Amino acid sequence: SDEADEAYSVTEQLTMTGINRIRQKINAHGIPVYLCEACGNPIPEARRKIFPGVTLCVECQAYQERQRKHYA
Amino acid sequence: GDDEDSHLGDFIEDTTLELPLDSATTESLRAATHDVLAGLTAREAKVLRMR
Amino acid sequence: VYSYTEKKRIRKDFGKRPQVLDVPYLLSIQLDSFQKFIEQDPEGQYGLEAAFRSVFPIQSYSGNSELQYVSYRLGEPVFDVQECQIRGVTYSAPLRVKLRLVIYEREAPEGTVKDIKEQEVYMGEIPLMTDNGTFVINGTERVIVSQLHRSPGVFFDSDKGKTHSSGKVLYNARIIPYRGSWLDFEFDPKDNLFVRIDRRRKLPATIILRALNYTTEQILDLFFEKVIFEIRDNKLQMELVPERLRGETASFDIEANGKVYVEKGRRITARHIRQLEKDDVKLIEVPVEYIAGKVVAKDYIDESTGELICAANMELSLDLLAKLSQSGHKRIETLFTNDLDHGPYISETLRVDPTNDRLSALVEIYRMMRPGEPPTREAAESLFENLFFSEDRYDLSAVGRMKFNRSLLREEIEGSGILSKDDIIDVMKKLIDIRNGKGEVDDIDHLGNRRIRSVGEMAENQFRVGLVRVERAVKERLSLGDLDTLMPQDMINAKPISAAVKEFFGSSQLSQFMDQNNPLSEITHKRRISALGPGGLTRERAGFEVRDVHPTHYGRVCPIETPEGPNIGLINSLSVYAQTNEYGFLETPYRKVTDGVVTDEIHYLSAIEEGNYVIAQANSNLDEEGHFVEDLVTCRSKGESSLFSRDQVDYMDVSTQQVVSVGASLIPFLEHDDANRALMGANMQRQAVPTLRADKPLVGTGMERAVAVDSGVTAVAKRGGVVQYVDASRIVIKVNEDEMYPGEAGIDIYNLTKYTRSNQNTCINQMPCVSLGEPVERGDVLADGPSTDLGELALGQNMRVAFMPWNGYNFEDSILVSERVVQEDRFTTIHIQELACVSRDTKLGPEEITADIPNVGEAALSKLDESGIVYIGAEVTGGDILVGKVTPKGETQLTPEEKLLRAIFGEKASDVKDSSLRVPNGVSGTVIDVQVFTRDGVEKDKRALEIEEMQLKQAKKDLSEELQILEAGLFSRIRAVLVAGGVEAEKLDKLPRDRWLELGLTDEEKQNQLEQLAEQYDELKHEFEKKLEAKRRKITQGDDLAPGVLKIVKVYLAVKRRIQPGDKMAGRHGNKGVISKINPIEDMPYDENGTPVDIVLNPLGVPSRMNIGQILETHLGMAAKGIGDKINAMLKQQQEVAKLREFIQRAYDLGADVRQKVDLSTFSDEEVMRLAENLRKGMPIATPVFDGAKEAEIKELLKLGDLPTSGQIRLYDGRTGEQFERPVTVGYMYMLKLNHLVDDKMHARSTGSYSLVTQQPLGGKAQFGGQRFGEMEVWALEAYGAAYTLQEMLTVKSDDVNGRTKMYKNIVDGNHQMEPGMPESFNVLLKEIRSLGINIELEDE
Amino acid sequence: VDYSGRSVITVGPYLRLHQCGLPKKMALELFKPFIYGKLELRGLATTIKAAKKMVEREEAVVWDILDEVIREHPVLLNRAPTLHRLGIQAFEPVLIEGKAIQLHPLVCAAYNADFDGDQMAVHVPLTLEAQLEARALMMSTNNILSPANGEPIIVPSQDVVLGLYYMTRDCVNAKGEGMVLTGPKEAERLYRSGLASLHARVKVRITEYEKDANGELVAKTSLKDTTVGRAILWMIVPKGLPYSIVNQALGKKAISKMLNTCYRILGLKPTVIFADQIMYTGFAYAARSGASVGIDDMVIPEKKHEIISEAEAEVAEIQEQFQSGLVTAGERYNKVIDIWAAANDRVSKAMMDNLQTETVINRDGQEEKQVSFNSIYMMADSGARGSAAQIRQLAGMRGLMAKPDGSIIETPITANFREGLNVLQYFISTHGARKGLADTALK
Ligand SMILES: [Mg+2]
Ligand SMILES: [Zn+2]
């Protein structure tokens, strides 16, 4: 087959695996947590209602995301 | 480097060889002259061979 | 408001935007760069003056022997361009320099000079640039592709991930100069910070700080912020800076005023910091444990003893707080460390610092640069100062300083040359801050780190290397320097620099053959960026990083034109409006934006200056005054793109085309194609061979005219005037009265270039298009080149396609071309092959070029003349002779019975061996032109004398036609003398022109004027006597051939290849194809009206490869031919000018907003008939690329004709005569003709020549040798049980040099046996193993 | 290797899958030695030199001599990357005008050769074991089963599948509706004469031969409620198969299991002859379908605008909740890409549901909906070329292009190829596209 057909298959592979990773991240299933998995603060309503079942307050989330921004 | 990957010795053709048409002609003519000397006598064929 | 030339056929132009930046002269890169290179440039900047001011003046070993620079010159060539393609010289230009050898007196530093011998010395021949940026090095037109390499400056790289297996990324920072020692910073996974000078050993990175006069106090106050603790009468108070506490553990009660605003254990969220800010806490009383891990900056010692309490950068434990308590300190300095943001790095690296202070650090640097050298005070000082602080031994170029100040967020873009304390410390701060979270890393591909060279700067560097290798010799010959006996040319050698510069221009990974097989190919080859070459990264070292596209390509390098396959992305093709900047980085236009207006001032942006702005998007409808139509518009700010408010944009794209190249901006309806497909489309449009009658893009993209004109092929008018005499060779423009210089007006003349070879073996023709007695405006085309037509780039031909399967003849991508396309000879492409027949000089004697040949009667010698060269015109075919050539071959060495045979018939065995230049087996042509070069040691034969006489007649004719014009200009100036002061009007046209010199005139300044102009006349006379003398002498001389050759005879066959199953073809959108059965006319489909659809492509290729652009192009084409046939009916049924005007006007307005309204009420009645006759084949249509014609416009433009709006007609099969169910699509698609011709590719070899080291097949002629029966094929045959075929595949057919001849004897004698033997390759292997001391033998049993 | 050649290839469906074309000139230059021998044997030229001059003049009798020595003399066609052991196969030659080594269409999938200019190299077997191996080890009709699995590698590829799929389908009210026929034969006499359209449900009397009688074939006739397409095709099926092999709508998977059943039940000879016959009749009825593609075929859902409106509304809501400090930047990024992927799937499913069932037509009564005859749809459904994803890109929105690193960019292409693309969307597409080429060209 042609040389662009194979490149289309690889692009499908690449974007599909990326998107399905990032959908695997977001939870969308409730496990009501009511305060952090680290700090203990109450998780406000709006945050727990957007992302159901989210273990961490906002600050703890930003902080872990920033320690992980340097990739561990 | 202009090709798959060559060295200039890989292109220097040959000139000692004989074109295999020549080999076939020489053999075919050996056979034909053999027959033509079959068309002579002992004195005839032997003298023309040895000549 | 059009010209009289532009009205030949006025391309219907969709495209809604107004163009505000007309297309730049597409070859700006090559021309402007080589212009900066070669010119006396009264300033030290770039050019040759740069190299000469760099390497000169040469001072000897202080001995008052100096050789300095004055100025240089570029003598005009000896052979001009076309002469230099005929003969084979390098179109050079001899150089000259005014070197000035000065010698000072001994007993004199600068005492009185004793000699200044000033003499001009030759060196090298820099090959000048043609008008088209294409040098001529050895007869062939070569082009030097611009390079793209890392700009000297600073770079902050990651090398993320894989190392150390923890995932933790490192953040290294390199300071690359133009010339000098590097400097690198890097983190270890243990997170201490290390340095390294040029790629040598690591070091505790604080050592270089200390080496720069830094002790620990000021280090810690540079790389850290302070937090003071206070002991105010009870237990360890602390300063409270409020924002110090975001994202941190609260290991204590944060009370204030005896009130609790934050409590222990928790985390200090933004709520807490907000409330502390509102509640005004400044000095919190925390326990000792929290100081227990802090770090102390300043030094502390017992003030009563002077004994060292705590060194700088030690961790305060409770005991040390106590110890300094009793010393009387209430201030305490502590580093504001933190795991998130203000991380401990320099402190812990001081932990790693083995050394203690400055001198030790300099010692360690001296011991890391070079081992074994014992350290020393002054040795250390010298070495460290001479790494980064020596104007002589280290210099960032000014480009270096500019990047180094723009990558630090500095102020001045230009400045010093060497580093400093502040440059190093800013590098380190930027590095630590990269690792702290704020800031990010510059990936490699970012065009802020790819400075673009070109011909100019690369040739300048090669001349630089030449100058250094010659100044070695200059200083050496000055070693022995006699003061006044060696003039300033025996110190130098000319051939060195010529060797270097020729090696560059003729042997480079850049200086490569022009892809001159289609005007788009040249002008997409000279616009080219390459990342390979000497000084760039090649494939192996790097690497996947640079293949990628990066969002700083938007208008600086084409994303949808790059050579697919082995090296993608390393051959980025430069954008349409891109340019090289002052420093070098690619830059592009942008329209400036005021408060809320879109100004029309275009303003250039490089790569590093863009992200700090916020650029709009060209696809933004703006409201007739320069205000946007909304308050929020799509933009792109820093890589990302998004909606912005109206009062925030700063820059709008110049035009919707600027994201692309001249390659992919010619694909109409590019906007609907998967980017891979536009890639393959442009990369198959660069290869279309110029057909016989190059027609036009029936559906174009606006840029096609600019590509045809700006490339060199079209014959563009230099000055507007009337046309006096057209002809198949020359065009004679009579310049007007206003475009005409004051003295010696004359008339412009263009000698076109008739049939002639290009590098790819095609026909670079030029045909006039402006007929006799016809105006032409300045800047207009006179003569179309190959594949241009009316000055509109026409690569292939338009023709009728119908998408439908049609019996598997178009199975995968195959194509089914009705014979109405090949009868017309419309893809019939002309290929002009060159065959040479040299005549060499062997030890036995000189080869003959006689017509007397053995073993060939008059039969093959009917086409030969009296001298062995063929006539100009004989239609040679496969296997005939073009040049009869015989080599003396002594020692016939008769054999057995062959000798008997010669006795039988007495036929004298000849002493001569036939070796005549016979046509390659297969071509079939017309010998259009025979040239005979001769070593000037041989008596030129009879035919070469015919050729000399003929060329000399031609040159005499030409130079005499030139003299006529010149003397007419001088007679004009004479009249301009008489016209003022006593002209006698009609007493000057009657008498002969030659007797105007003796015209009466009073002896004023005007009589002396007549005398002076007579002097000019006689000067012209003698000038052209001697110039025709020089022309006759260039022709008459011998040539200067290669060593040992008598005479070469070139013979230019001119084949005409038609079309035949195998010839690749392709649209523009990337639908390849291999025309597969050249069907009759009857068989083809035919719409209800009768016309058979010429091509028949395949429907299964539009959905699977999402290039729906070809269906939209087919529909726009069908509508176009609808308009065409309507005009054809209105013209054949001949109506009038009136109906034609109303109808063409209906076609040119057509609905939606456009920028093309023409108003034919200004076309005279007789121009509209010419306009119709140029439209009667079909109304062209423009469609700017990302701004094309949306579907509904096409549907209405169909309804203006009479086609069905669906686009799909109902077709009747041609064989059975019964309607195809489900109507097909038919239309006029423009199809190229790629030159992967079949008869170039076909090949077959039964018994050819053979190699010399291993008796394998090797042929040459078209690799006249077997296909490589490689290894994977051997795996294949072993997979089957077949082993006999393998054994003969590499014992009988290939190597065993008795096996093959016995196989041939058997084949002729009808006995398909084989007698293998053993391969000669393995026998070579036995010998090569055995030459080594390895006794390999074969047991025999 | 002496005795070889190579050239650009082409299609030529008029062949049987055990024989390839071979140009006259390439034939005469491969088989020079055998030709010389044949000439001096038949006495048409005295000695080998004269035979050389004769074939170098291309006289009249050399062509007849070559047509004799090319009668049963198999050659070996090969391609450049010979991945697996089918990269080399024998064929008998068929002498051709021109310069293209014409290749049988079913053989492509084995060679993995498309006809867009990929060159094939012909070797010629010399010895007599070599010819016997080309005939009984490497002939094309003795490699139908891939060595990597017993299933056939003679699966019809693209035009033939569209041919069969358009031949054996059914609309609801065409000509000759519900009439009765007495065999496949008068179904053919119907269709080729213009009384009943190619696919219109009919009753026929087919006669399927089951063979439970061990190697014996028990006849059995019936009245299948089938179409005119199916009964016209059933003539090409051999005796062995049962009639339910074709009574369905013949995609590509089903058509390959047709051949697989025929091979398992009857063997190799009838399955070769049946591969040839399916290919021929598929090509003919596809060329008769007129199945063209066109720009009116790609029916955007009118509901796409609402889906994208709501998608951008939810993204703006996440935006507001990001400025309010209620979700970190990572979580807003993932919420955005989530709601866009949801919108992508919704638009895809809505377009496919407007594209497949769109044919609502009327049988002798009110109306009915049925699987569409939409050219782009059949080319995506039967299995000729493409599938739901590529159609999704021509009608629905086109996904989210993802830059090469992996971090899929969050500015989704809200447009598609039928509509245009503005410059941002295209310049984003370039990232993923050039990445795709740069990998499958290093591959
Ligand atoms: Mg291919
Ligand atoms: Zn928390």
Overall morphology of chain D: globular
Structural class of chain B: mainly alpha
Through-space gap between termini of chain D: 28 Å
Number of E-type strands of chain D: 9
Number of helices of chain B: 2
The biggest sheet of chain B, with number of strands, parallel, antiparallel or mixed sense and barrel status, is:
none
Name the quaternary structure: part of a larger assembly
List how many beta strands of chain B DSSP finds. 0
User: What is the CATH-assigned architecture of the domain at 303-443 in chain D?
Assistant: Orthogonal Bundle
Cα distance spanning the termini of chain B: 57 Å
Q: Treating each run of at least 4 consecutive H or I residues as one helix, how many helices of chain D? A: 16
Secondary structural class of chain D: alpha+beta
* Largest beta-sheet details of chain D: 5 strands, mixed
CATH class wording of the domain at 303-443 in chain D: Mainly Alpha
Radius of gyration of chain B: 22 Å
Which two protein chains have the largest interface (Cβ within 8 Å of the partner's Cβ), and how many residues from each? C-D, 131 and 123 residues
CATH superfamily of the domain at 303-443 in chain D: RNA polymerase Rpb1 funnel domain
Protein name (chain D): DNA-directed RNA polymerase subunit beta'
Binding site for Mg(2+) (chain D): 114, 116, 118
Family (chain D): Belongs to the RNA polymerase beta' chain family.
Zinc finger (dksA C4-type) (chain A): 36-60
Account of the 3D structure:
By secondary structure, chain A is an all-alpha fold. Helices cover 57% and strands 0% of the residues of chain A. Chain A has one domain. The longest helix of chain A has 23 residues, at 3-25. Chain A is elongated. By secondary structure, chain B is an all-alpha fold. Chain B has helices spanning 20-38, 42-50. In chain C, a hairpin with a 5-residue loop joins strand 2 (58-59) and strand 3. In chain C, strands 2, 3, 4, 5 and 6 form a five-stranded antiparallel sheet that branches. A five-stranded antiparallel sheet of chain C has the order 10-11-12-13-14. With 1341 residues, chain C is α+β, with helices and mostly antiparallel strands. Chain C is built from 31 helices and 65 strands. Chain C has a domain at 831-947 and 1044-1056: RNA polymerase II, Rpb2 subunit, wall domain (OB fold (Dihydrolipoamide Acetyltransferase, E2P), Beta Barrel), CATH 2.40.50.150. Chain D is α+β, with helices and mostly antiparallel strands and 443 residues long. Chain D has a domain at 303-443: RNA polymerase Rpb1 funnel domain (Topoisomerase I, Chain A, domain 4, Orthogonal Bundle), CATH 1.10.132. The longest helix of chain D has 27 residues, at 329-355. Helix content of chain D is 43%, strand content 9%. Chain D has helices spanning 24-30, 32-42, 48-57, 60-69, 108-111, 128-136, 159-167, 184-191, 228-234, 253-266, 269-289, 304-323, 329-355, 375-381, 388-394, 423-442, and strands spanning 4-8, 19-23, 75-78, 88-96, 119-123, 202-204, 224-226, 360-361, 368-369. Chains in contact: A-C, A-D, B-C, B-D, C-D. Residues 36, 38-39, 41, 56-57, 60 of chain A line the site of zinc ion (ZN). Zinc ion (ZN) binds at residues 36, 38-39, 41, 56-57, 60 of chain A. Chain D: Belongs to the RNA polymerase beta' chain family. Chain D: This is DNA-directed RNA polymerase subunit beta'. Chain D: It comes from Escherichia coli (strain K12). Chain D: Mg(2+) binds at residues 114, 116, 118. Chain D: DNA-dependent RNA polymerase (RNAP) catalyzes the transcription of DNA into RNA using the four ribonucleoside triphosphates as substrates.
